[PDB]
Design a protein around this ligand. Structure first.
Ligand SMILES: Nc1ncnc2c1ncn2[C@@H]1O[C@H](COP(=O)(O)OP(=O)(O)O)[C@@H](O)[C@H]1O
Ligand SMILES: Nc1ncnc2c1ncn2[C@@H]1O[C@H](COP(=O)(O)OP(=O)(O)O)[C@@H](O)[C@H]1O
Ligand SMILES: Nc1ncnc2c1ncn2[C@@H]1O[C@H](COP(=O)(O)OP(=O)(O)O)[C@@H](O)[C@H]1O
Ligand SMILES: Nc1ncnc2c1ncn2[C@@H]1O[C@H](COP(=O)(O)OP(=O)(O)O)[C@@H](O)[C@H]1O
Ligand SMILES: Nc1ncnc2c1ncn2[C@@H]1O[C@H](COP(=O)(O)OP(=O)(O)O)[C@@H](O)[C@H]1O
Ligand SMILES: Nc1ncnc2c1ncn2[C@@H]1O[C@H](COP(=O)(O)OP(=O)(O)O)[C@@H](O)[C@H]1O
Ligand SMILES: [Ca+2]
Ligand SMILES: [Ca+2]
Ligand SMILES: [Ca+2]
Ligand SMILES: [Ca+2]
Ligand SMILES: [Ca+2]
Ligand SMILES: [Ca+2]
Lengths: 269, 269, 269, 270, 275, 269
């Protein structure tokens, strides 16, 4: 189950302050799109109200945004991925001038941001996540029917808006949020593939997502599975390390490599 | 050869309508998410049952084609394949929080979803499907004139809307539905080819199709034959295993490899 | 000459029937487009009247659609080849529930559909077509001035609409129709080339064309010579066999390989 | 150097007008089929004959350029992209001739009417072979830098594709031996995905459509075709072009490497 | 860690305003030339000086971010595609300086005004070289993950390209040693067909246009440029970048592998000078 | 300095006759665009008027078009680079029926047109141009701050319109005009790269530019440095020789190869 502590209740006000304090946007190959902070606040309030209906114990099924919110839109005519970058402009989510809030998960003293759980298909990513990492909230997206779907920690989403709502919303409150998988986004990323058989904007998106979590004191682990050649995975993992607060590589059911940006410094394996 | 409607099928009609109304679904490829009109599937089920009532329950595949039973066969209610992912949004069909309904076909105790019948051209996919699999309903799409077209189990469709209508409609009632083949969709998949000489959205589509069947308690076998190199088929089959409930590989008229997600767990050969 | 037998006259009524009974469309990378059946019927009527005015012995020049019909259009604002597959939908011409009508040409007991006469430039396709296959009607499209143009069996077309009119129109009556060539359609196929250096929709088009002939009891031989590498022709011929009722490979002025789907079964060489 | 108008040319004027009016033609590339205004070609022929009459039959290539003789040089009669559905634009190929083509003595004996492609790498001797070995009656110069051939009285300097077809169909139908050096402005602007041989497939369709356009109007034209292709891939492309033209000439190190001509005595390879 | 405003900076304010008004500039990429609103840069300089005055000369990078000081951060003043005819859009390059450019002591001695490009593969030590060896006065942080450099009082966190140019031209003209870590948000969103070296050709034109923009406004800027390029094509890309900037530094294995600086003493390739 | 001789003053009338006599246009991948001859005439008049106010000694800074003309536009709604060639038409600047005016620069007896100074980055193109070629007017465009910018012969431009104005305007008068560089145009050439890793229209543009100078009796040297592989430069240089009146290749600070079309014939090294 997903148990709501007094620590989570005390973070509600702070979470609302963090969201209102900084206006954020996101961009991919098109034009920068603003994130409606209000929706995340509304989600937190809905989760707290339901938590109150129960004994603080929540079922992942009951906290899905499609059930709690009338509208699940976070992004507020249509632009092509091959338009002039000077007509659309360029946006990256700004960094934190202050020291980021540290966490005990996925690693000790890790800064707020995003961790990428990498590896080839069947390398043990989902296994490593649920057995070794053991998240408080397990977001399930674009993955076939598995044993992890029967878990009361599992929250089934359909859109990118829903992913960010649950990640920012619950992550800000102090929950250890995880996403399995981020394949719906990755496999629909349109554009010319750069060095490593993957679009360059993929690395920019990971940085923008990481900083979005750093700003809202979230500690999120995302399963990032790329359609990349068996030997080109090492290059891509090195490139992802420069774009995320955390990075975990899986090979043959075990953890091959690690990288974490902590209060004790950047730790490699 | 005939398609017989048992009392078991009649008793599932109400449940099928209940599953369809309970969850609103959509589908996305490289464009924008498009909603699926559930009502059309319900209307199809009612038309099949009405005809089964007039006949002895012994129905001919020719008489149950949607173009004949329905006035309009549309299930989806103009965007380029190279448009910003943030302007269209991303959609994946949500997972099942509950345990999926098990089936005896194509394998014992297999969960509801999709099975991909893979193999090179002339590897014996169509032969394995009809002789070894023995499906109740055989959907024939984008295939040249063969002996399987003269079968009373054969239902000849033209559109993707029709495929989903027959698959969800009859599959929900408990019928063992099969599609030979899904080639018109695969060969019209526009986009930049990823690792393995195939567009990445192909794997996302298989998962979205699988989850669509998992949600509506369907057990469907689709023969998937995409344009891929003779040696690159092993990589693609491994990737498809991570995107479907079932996977069957054909080589020299026989079954080379198998993967099934059952109540007894994931079974490899 | 092109001689009209009583057997052809007796098929006129059956041809109008077949054409009215099933509404057909065609799709490539755009949106599905309906085929106006009336135009084919109008063409048959104009050919029969001219055959009745002359001695039954017609000249290919006199039966060209541009001469017999006021308008040659078969297809009834503008869509790009890179448009979302979900916005246009997917269409494949439906298969035949009944047994297809057999023919003695290009092979004994062959089912109605299309035969692809394949080979590199100067492999002997056009020689094999005119000397070994001996067609009744020879449609000449996208080819330079050759000896075959002076033939009384030769009918010179300009559009794809005209090709289908003569193929379906005369083919349905029992004539052995051949197209030399289909290069104006192949070389103008816009899209990203799949495995084998050729667009995947090419194989779907051959199946759709074949089934169009299977439905209207036609036996058509099309010379198909797409821009493909000298060594990649074997792979492409292999994929074409899985997309057509007949397949003939030319090399060094002679027949290299054959495949025919007959009443006695699929025959390979 | 001069362009002389014989009685044979004068006697063909009526026949040329008949050939043009008899068959309506179009052209297509990656967009939609575009009709060719036959009237413009007839108007050009009339202007050339009138000037030939004022002179002694002896004409200067400079004086017979379409931009000088016609007020409007347009042959093709809102805007479509090269990546549009083939089914929405339709497909057009210029129809073949049911009758025997009109044979010529140039570039080869008994060669049928149509187009000949003068191929070869850059500096292989295409322009040299064209002017020294071929000896054309009319030399169309297009998209080529300043050379000795521009000072020739046979040289007619054009700017558009419309102008090329006007001079090719107009003068070729009358019986003149017309040549184009070169067709690089069309080839280098051919938009589309490059097929096998590092060149767009529609290139081969265009050569056939151009060939048949000349076959129908009994024109004997030699076009120097030099597309951007790899040094070793030229052999493959030349073989493919042979299947798309009435004539084909390959140049290598200033000399003629290979030949192909479709004649009344049959197809002749070297 | 702090950003100190000297009398030298105060004396440059007028000079900077004149430089901006004297020459009208634009920028182009694959679309239509877009004009740069000089007024916004002047307004930013005035806001920085006014705040420097309220504080004791010393300023915090957080307080000088354009989003905080200006009501609108737009520098570029309907929508054109990256694949439009070059003749329908025309071509624009920022013009060169007819006079001798203002020399600087940073990033190299006697260097001309313009842009310096700090190259290297990922984890080659670009950010380390920038902060330890180069020591910039103002550190612009853009599209980079949470690092130790973000806690620095020299760090100014931006989000747009408009903001980058405002801080670079605005503070750089006054005499500050401005650095950008990273320029990746721009590089990773460069739409177009990749040329030789697995990178769009307009990338090199943009570096030259950015360099000349700084040469005209007497700025000395160091931009860290991380290219999505294969391990073996980095040498080719660097050679090409050297021909497009006033300064270029290559990083490999935590150290400086190669340098190029256009100084008053001439073009110096791989000099004996610690940064 | 830039000195105006009596020879230049005597050419003013002839330059107007040349510009008025032939209407010209330019095309790239879009539609043909007319060149407004009047603007070039206006520029010549402004240069001569200023040369008069001076002692015949002009500063390159004072003769820049942005300073002398109110509007710098030469080309007189918006078309895509991937539009049908038949809808835009094709334009090449026409050749000269007469013998071209000869020059003593960059080579003895060279015909009027364009010379391409080629070579890898840092091969010594700019060095060869200013030390060995010694041009009368050095147009500086899209190049970084160098010693050549402080030269009184240097004229700094921003647009392609400005380049052609100075090249045609001053070149027609007899000045030895050079451009360092043509990179702003070359690095913004949109389209599919042909053989040699460069767009085919690049070679057509060089010929069109060369013929534009041949028609207006100009002798211009352009630094052409396109993004091409280290080994592919030899192929491209050979192709450029077939597209220009002059061609110079640079390697390791020295001149590797030369080609000039003179009154004494085509001279190779
Ligand atoms: N093709 C295969 N054959 C055998 N076992 C496999 C195969 N693919 C995966 N497995 C098993 O599944 C485990 C990985 O499961 P999982 O965590 O779901 O992988 P991932 O999330 O990376 O796709 C492996 O350690 C192995 O035991
Ligand atoms: N090229 C070939 N040569 C010989 N036999 C072939 C060939 N291609 C297919 N076959 C025969 O057809 C069988 C496969 O039929 P089928 O099930 O229709 O294949 P698929 O559906 O995979 O295309 C093979 O087992 C073999 O007996
Ligand atoms: N490159 C060539 N060299 C020599 N003869 C050739 C060549 N190409 C074709 N031929 C001749 O033409 C014949 C093939 O003719 P044809 O059927 O028209 O070819 P295609 O396969 O292109 O339709 C060959 O048998 C040979 O006699
Ligand atoms: N790179 C070169 N080196 C030496 N001579 C050359 C070179 N390129 C061309 N030539 C000379 O020019 C002749 C070819 O001239 P030309 O007919 O104009 O060629 P093309 O029209 O095929 O481009 C060759 O036979 C040779 O004498
Ligand atoms: N894969 C790695 N394994 C070990 N150390 C690494 C790795 N990647 C980077 N480092 C360390 O980080 C340093 C580079 O840090 P940084 O300046 O942030 O690089 P950059 O800015 O070029 O991405 C290296 O000198 C090395 O000590
Ligand atoms: N990577 C380098 N290493 C050393 N010297 C170089 C390098 N690149 C250029 N140079 C020097 O600069 C000279 C070339 O200068 P320049 O004319 O500006 O070249 P270009 O115009 O072709 O880019 C060379 O002759 C050499 O002395
Ligand atoms: Ca998994
Ligand atoms: Ca099959
Ligand atoms: Ca042939
Ligand atoms: Ca030539
Ligand atoms: Ca860094
Ligand atoms: Ca230079």
């Amino acid at each position: 189950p997903i148990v709501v502590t007094q620590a989570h209740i005390d973070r509600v006000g702070i979470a609302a302050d963090l969201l209102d304090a900084s206006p954020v946007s996101l961009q991919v190959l098109g034009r920068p799109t603003a994130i409606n902070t209000v929706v995340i606040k509304t989600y937190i309030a809905a989760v707290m109200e339901l938590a109150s209906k129960q004994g603080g114990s929540l079922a992942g099924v009951d906290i899905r945004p499609s059930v709690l919110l009338k509208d699940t839109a976070i992004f507020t005519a249509d632009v092509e991925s091959d338009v002039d970058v000077l007509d659309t402009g360029i946006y990256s989510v700004p960094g934190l001038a202050r020291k980021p809030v540290t966490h005990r998960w996925p690693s000790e003293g890790i800064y707020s941001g995003v961790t990428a759980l990498m590896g080839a298909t069947g390398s043990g990513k989902s296994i490593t996540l649920n057995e070794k990492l053991r998240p408080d909230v397990l977001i399930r997206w674009g993955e076939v029917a598995e044993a992890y779907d029967e878990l009361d920690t599992a929250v089934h989403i359909s859109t990118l808006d829903e992913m960010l709502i649950v990640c920012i919303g619950l992550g800000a409150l102090g929950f250890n949020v995880a996403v399995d998988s981020v394949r719906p986004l990755l496999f629909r990323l349109k554009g010319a593939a750069s060095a490593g058989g993957i679009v360059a904007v993929f690395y920019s998106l990971l940085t923008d997502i990481s900083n979005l979590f750093t700003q809202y004191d979230c500690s999120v682990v995302m399963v990032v599975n790329p359609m990349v050649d068996a030997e080109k995975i090492e290059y891509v993992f090195g490139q992802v390390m420069a774009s995320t607060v955390g990075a975990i590589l899986c090979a043959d059911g075990n953890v091959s490599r690690t990288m974490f940006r902590t209060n004790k410094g950047r730790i490699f394996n």
